[PDB]
């Protein structure tokens, strides 16, 4: 039978405006292996995104790591968009960054 993908987003370093970083989307636990994963910057797809070679776990479910180098600013939102046969619609998982305290 089929299995729906788990989607986890994280940056390699703490978010610092103007400093280059690496954005990661780790997709795991899905079956079959046919899947579409995009990294989003402000809602638009990021070109030049690397991903690891397809692999699977002991329960035969597949996993992948999508990543790209990036430089966050004060306004940019980042997310991971995944489409799979188990999904009715593409699921979007945001990169959860802390922009500091709000009230100046």
């Amino acid at each position: 039978i089929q299995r729906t993908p788990k989607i986890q987003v994280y940056s390699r370093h703490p978010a610092e405006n103007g400093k280059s970083n690496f954005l990661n989307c780790y997709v795991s636990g899905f079956h079959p292996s046919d899947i579409e994963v995009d990294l989003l910057k402000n809602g638009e797809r990021i070109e030049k995104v690397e991903h690891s070679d397809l692999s699977f776990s002991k329960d035969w479910s597949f996993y992948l790591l999508y990543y790209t180098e990036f430089t966050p600013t004060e306004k940019d939102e980042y997310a991971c968009r995944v489409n799979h046969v188990t999904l009715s619609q593409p699921k979007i998982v945001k990169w959860d960054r802390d922009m500091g305290s709000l009230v100046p």
Partner: protein
């Protein structure tokens, strides 16, 4: 601990996809190029103790068995009740200082496996897996070759490789850590997130603390890979909005030699005045 995985996707009788890779412990060391039929060495020490002539035979052996597998699958697909599109996964390897394995899955479920000298069907996989073992065991000389690949050729590949590239598996890379707010908390609650990034090897200790008291509400996430060969982990703690005082994250890792990373929920995080 070395093993090789196969991912064969059969979309129809005319469209296929074959993905092969080899793994030392947890580091991908080899990849198959479907075009040119060549084993791609990912690192200068991927070839190990073996010469160019032996690799040419290994490429040819895997070349013949792959062509023979894909043709045999499409020839017997109807008899085996294989309905397109389907996916077959294979994983096989070894380790000493001992064990050996070779498992095959159909549509992501246990189908058949190799035991000592022949293919045994998984009983739950039913008759179609017994029919599959009839075709896999039709040539005992091929099952003897498969045996020696697992018991002899595989541990020999670990020798000339796990000794040459032993330094990388024992490398100690210190983690970095930072704190942030988490999303999706309960009403009137906060989610405190402790990130631990860039450490190697994999074993790591991380807990939210109140001084010396470990906070047992610490929810440790999955250890996620990083493309530079290091690992990443999130540890979250949900607290009432008032009780977030004197909280800190403590990280223990072999590379730190007892000098734990300790970060305090403080500054703009609280936020102070």
């Amino acid at each position: 601990s070395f093993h090789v995985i196969w991912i064969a996707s059969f979309y129809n009788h005319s469209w296929k996809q074959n993905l092969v890779s080899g793994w030392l412990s947890d580091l991908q060391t080899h990849t198959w190029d479907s075009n040119s039929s060549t084993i791609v060495f990912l690192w200068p020490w991927s070839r190990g103790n073996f010469s160019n002539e032996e690799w040419k035979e290994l490429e040819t052996l895997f070349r013949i068995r792959t062509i023979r597998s894909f043709e045999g699958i499409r020839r017997y697909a109807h008899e085996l009740q294989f309905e397109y599109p389907f996916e077959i996964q294979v994983t096989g390897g070894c380790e000493l200082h001992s064990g050996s394995f070779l498992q095959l899955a159909y549509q992501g479920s246990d189908f058949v496996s190799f035991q000592n000298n022949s293919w045994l069907p998984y009983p739950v996989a039913g008759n179609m897996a017994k029919h599959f073992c009839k075709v896999l065991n039709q040539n005992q000389h091929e099952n003897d070759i498969t045996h020696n690949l697992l018991s002899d050729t595989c541990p020999r590949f670990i020798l000339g490789l796990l000794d040459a590239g032993k330094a990388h598996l024992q490398r100690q890379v210190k983690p970095e850590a930072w704190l942030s707010h988490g999303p999706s908390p309960g009403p009137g609650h906060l989610q405190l997130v402790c990130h631990v990034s860039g450490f190697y090897p994999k074993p790591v200790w991380v807990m939210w603390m109140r001084g010396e008291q470990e906070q047992q509400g610490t929810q440790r996430g999955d250890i996620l890979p990083s493309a530079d060969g290091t690992w990443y982990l999130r540890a979250t703690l949900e607290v009432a909005a008032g009780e977030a005082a004197d909280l800190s994250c403590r990280v223990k890792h072999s590379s730190l030699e007892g000098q734990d990373i300790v970060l305090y929920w403080e500054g703009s995080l609280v936020p102070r005045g």
